[PDB]
Each structure stands twice: as structure tokens, then as C-alpha cells.
Amino acid sequence: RKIGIIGGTFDPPHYGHLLIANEVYHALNLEEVWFLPNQIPPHKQGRNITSVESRLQMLELATEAEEHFSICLEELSRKGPSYTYDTMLQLTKKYPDVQFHFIIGGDMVEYLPKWYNIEALLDLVTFVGVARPGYKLRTPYPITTVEIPEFAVSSSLLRERYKEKKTCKYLLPEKVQVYIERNGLYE
Amino acid sequence: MRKIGIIGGTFDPPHYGHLLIANEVYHALNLEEVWFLPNQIPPHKQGRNITSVESRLQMLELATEAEEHFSICLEELSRKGPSYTYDTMLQLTKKYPDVQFHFIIGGDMVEYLPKWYNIEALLDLVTFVGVARPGYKLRTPYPITTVEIPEFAVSSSLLRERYKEKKTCKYLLPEKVQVYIERNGLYES
């Protein structure tokens, strides 16, 4: 019934993603959270980038130990560039029984008005914003706030670190780390 | 064996913030090892319903046993009365006269530093290390080394508050530490 949705390139997946998923899953009492991998946008595309194959494997190794965490390949499967609205439009139909909670960073709530079909989107899913404790998102949109201790880690940051041969311990699952060294990613 | 880091705290309970900081400062300043220094229970708190020192100690043990370069320094838990950082470092200074201690403190706490007992004298015994978020560096007249570490706002107080209210703490501290907290019923009532 109540399913959370976390989008991203998950290149690579990390503890920040798991923490956010877990906090929201409990704070709002969802039955499960789906990680919705986004395809690497055209302007970032090029060789030397991670294959979809690898990202999905890291994501599975990252969500392996959690039965209430799943991977929703719906956006990555469909043709190419999908506005968030379209993806959610297609999911609502395939699962009319589910009330999706789209999870985003509080930093993003400031740009929702620039999101494609944002108006209609709000009719398809319930937005959940993430904010540091002691803060609430004040916005004209009906958005749900969930306070979560800040963990300044991102896929971008991790790729940069693996390039500088810098330590990434405690930043992401050890399974993902092994996989990264084994296949020499971001090297 | 010159460069040794030190991280003080209640470790009630220890959590990933401790581990991340210890790891980051370790590689950053190329330390020989990092010692976690459990604080002694405040005398005005003796008798309340606070976690036993031994429990804090076993959890810290559980949190650091898979790490070669991490260890526990019991200096402060050797004296029953009130504990002051100056005396502890003075004592450690004598037991290990060849070691160059790097006291690691949070970016926030940097402001309270002038209010530390015998701070002037302590500054001669240790090289302070402030953890800062990338970009925003700390500003103090005191000579302290800066180390940028990705923020992870987790504290023992937070974890204590959460367990009492029976709120989730997943990914905020080691599973072996959580197992121990469960099996022994810490943080309840």
C-alpha cells in the first residue's frame, strides 16, 4: 500500500541511500522502499562510464540484506529520457493499489516548481523531503518532511575519492567496495 | 611510534561517527594508530540510571575489534574521581614520552576550547585536530590542525534518545554494538 521511492544513478550506491530509505520507511511506516535507478543523463554519458550492468549489481549488493528494499527497473527499462512524471504515471497504472512516496533531498524542494508536470505529479505521488533535524521545509507544495541526521556523502564524491585513491571506509557497504576494486571501477 | 590520535567521548554508545572520524584523521595525518579514550562517569551522575562503564567498554570493544590500528586507552577510567583532560594527557605524556598525541575534537567543540581546564598548559602537551566539513574551516587563535571529513551528524546522545523512544538506529552504529544493546537491554525506561 505505502511504498517509498528513491531515485538516483546509484553509481555507486552508498550508506546515504540506505540511511534515507530506512529513516523514511519507519517515520512514515511504509511496507517497502523501491530504489529507482536513473540512466546517466546524455551530457554525462561517454565511454569510461559505468555500465548499467555494474550499477545494478552494486545496487543489489547494497540492498541484498534488506527484504523490504527492492529495485524498480521501470525507468531504466523504458526507452530513454523519462520525465519523473512519466515514470510515476506508468507506475501508478501498473500498481494502482500503491500510494507512492517520492523521496528527495530538502535542497531539491526549492526547485519542484521547475519539475515537468509537477502539478499533476503531486496528484500521483506524495512527496517526502529530507531535512536536517531542527528544520522543516517551508514550501507552497504539500510535501512531507522527514528529519534525518546529515551524512554528506554522494556517488559523485565517492567516484572522485576512488580516483584519488582516497579511503572510502564507512561511506558505503563493504560488498560494494569489493565489487568496485574487483572490477576496477572509477579507476 | 610517534603519531597517535585520540578521540574522547562517553561512547555510550560508540557509533560510526567515531569510526569515520578516526579513519579519516588516520589516513589524512598518517597516524600510527588512533586511541579511543572513554570518559569517566561524572560524579554528579553516579547513581542515576546511566550505562555502566563496563558496558560502554564492551561496546567500544565490539565497535573496534575488526580494526587493527584502533585501540582503547583506559587512562581516564583508572581514577574514580572527576576526570580532566589536562591531567590525563599529562599522565599519557609520561607513560609514552616518545609519542606525539593528536587530540581530535569536533568542529563545534573548537569554540569551547578556551574554557577547558588548564588549556594553555594542555596546548603544550598535545596537537589538537579539528574535524571540519569540506569548505568551511574552523577559526580559532589556537594552533590546531584541520582535517576535512564528510559530515555525519550522529552522536551518543542522539542514539540514546532514539533507543528510549524505540526509534530505529540502523546504519548509525555497528550491528555488533546494536546486538549487545538489545541482548542486555541498555537504554530503556
Side-chain angles (χ1 to χ4, degrees), chain A:
Chain A
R1 184 46 169 168
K2 285 175 170 298
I3 299 195
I5 286 188
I6 299 180
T9 63
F10 300 110
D11 180 44
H14 54 62
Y15 280 128
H17 297 123
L18 305 184
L19 174 65
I20 293 174
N22 190 270
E23 297 292 307
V24 180
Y25 170 90
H26 291 110
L28 307 191
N29 187 296
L30 311 177
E31 67 162 47
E32 52 186 295
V33 179
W34 299 358
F35 294 73
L36 198 63
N38 300 164
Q39 176 52 287
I40 292 185
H43 54 263
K44 289 288 182 180
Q45 281 173 31
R47 55 176 186 291
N48 300 75
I49 74 173
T50 302
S51 70
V52 168
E53 171 98 296
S54 288
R55 291 174 256 144
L56 293 188
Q57 259 305 299
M58 290 189 294
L59 192 55
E60 245 150 2
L61 289 170
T63 51
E64 219 178 19
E66 289 304 310
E67 87 291 351
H68 55 179
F69 280 177
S70 302
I71 293 173
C72 174
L73 303 170
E74 193 64 53
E75 194 170 72
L76 216 55
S77 174
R78 293 184 170 297
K79 296 74 262 294
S82 286
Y83 292 114
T84 298
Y85 173 70
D86 294 313
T87 308
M88 294 320 295
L89 170 52
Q90 217 58 199
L91 290 177
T92 192
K93 281 201 279 289
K94 299 184 181 182
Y95 310 93
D97 211 62
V98 178
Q99 184 201 321
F100 303 88
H101 293 67
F102 207 92
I103 311 165
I104 63 175
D107 57 66
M108 180 59 80
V109 181
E110 181 179 299
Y111 308 124
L112 285 171
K114 298 188 175 184
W115 278 44
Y116 183 74
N117 240 38
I118 214 303
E119 307 300 347
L121 183 42
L122 293 173
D123 299 315
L124 302 178
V125 305
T126 295
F127 270 87
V128 180
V130 182
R132 296 167 188 175
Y135 285 96
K136 180 173 296 300
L137 287 304
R138 191 249 75 216
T139 172
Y141 298 98
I143 191 173
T144 295
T145 298
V146 176
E147 288 182 45
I148 302 174
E150 173 178 37
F151 192 5
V153 60
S154 68
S155 294
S156 172
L157 178 164
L158 290 166
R159 296 198 292 281
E160 132 88 63
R161 280 205 181 205
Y162 275 108
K163 286 192 172 179
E164 292 190 305
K165 287 146 66 185
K166 186 166 187 177
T167 184
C168 284
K169 205 175 171 193
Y170 307 115
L171 300 183
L172 70 179
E174 296 212 309
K175 262 193 167 62
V176 176
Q177 311 185 218
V178 173
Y179 184 98
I180 289 183
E181 285 303 303
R182 198 68 188 67
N183 299 72
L185 305 185
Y186 325 119
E187 198 169 313

Side-chain angles (χ1 to χ4, degrees), chain B residues 150-169:
Chain B
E151 188 58 53
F152 187 18
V154 63
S155 71
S156 300
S157 170
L158 175 78
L159 295 172
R160 274 198 304 282
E161 295 266 302
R162 292 194 161 205
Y163 276 111
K164 298 203 195 76
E165 311 309 291
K166 313 172 187 185
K167 188 177 185 182
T168 189
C169 296

Side-chain angles (χ1 to χ4, degrees), chain B residues 6-8 17-18 21 25 103-113 116 128-133 138-140 144-147 149 151:
Chain B
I6 290 190
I7 305 175
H18 294 132
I21 290 174
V25 180
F103 208 88
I104 304 162
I105 62 170
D108 290 314
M109 174 57 94
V110 181
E111 291 92 76
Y112 284 122
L113 215 52
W116 277 24
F128 279 98
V129 180
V131 179
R133 40 166 57 277
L138 318 317
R139 296 168 179 298
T140 180
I144 74 173
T145 300
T146 296
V147 176
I149 301 174
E151 188 58 53

